[PDB]
């Protein structure tokens, strides 16, 4: 069903995240972490403070698609387990801010394709696949667009309904 996802997403922020490569994503699936840069660090530890949840959808560029959508259960922080990103070229780890712990809601794929009727007024009502690494996804868009998604048979939103 989709009714906790809609009870999760009641009231929340959405941030689209840019990610250069599939090994990231596939890093922050298997660990449920993230790091951005600290322009978007700072935006995204104001954004916690501020809502019931805040939801990170991921897009590898170039791939066409959307990988999936998190919550953030956790401002970031530094000093924690290294994490091996694979960093843009000329990029150091110390460029990086903290760390945000997330919980996954939803690890399968959506095409672009099938987000073509959803703009973003936030970014100039742009179909929300356009954006740059950290553009706020206005609420409504959001919601349609996280519930586009298939459904993740693996995932039980109760354990994520208990941390809001």
């Not at 009231?11 to 994503?25: G, T």
């Not at 596939?26 to 939801?55: D, H, M, Q, Y």
């Not at 959803?118 to 996280?146: A, F, S």
């Amino acid at each position: 069903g989709t009714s906790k996802l809609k009870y999760v997403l009641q009231d929340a922020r959405f941030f689209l995240i840019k990610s250069n490569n599939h090994e990231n994503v596939s890093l922050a699936k298997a660990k449920g972490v993230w790091s951005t840069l600290p322009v978007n660090e700072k935006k995204l530890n104001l954004a916690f403070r501020s809502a019931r949840s805040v939801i990170l959808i991921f897009s590898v560029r170039e791939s066409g698609k959307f990988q999936g959508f998190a919550r953030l259960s956790s401002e970031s922080h530094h000093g924690g387990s290294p994490i091996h990103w694979v960093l843009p070229a000329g990029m150091s780890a110390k460029m990086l801010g903290g760390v945000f712990k997330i919980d996954w809601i939803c690890r399968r794929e959506l095409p672009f394709t099938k987000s073509a009727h959803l703009t973003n007024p936030w970014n100039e009502h742009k179909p929300v696949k356009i954006g740059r690494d950290g553009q706020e996804i206005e609420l409504e868009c959001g919601t349609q667009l996280c519930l586009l998604f298939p459904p993740d048979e693996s995932i039980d939103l109760y354990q994520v309904i208990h941390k809001m």
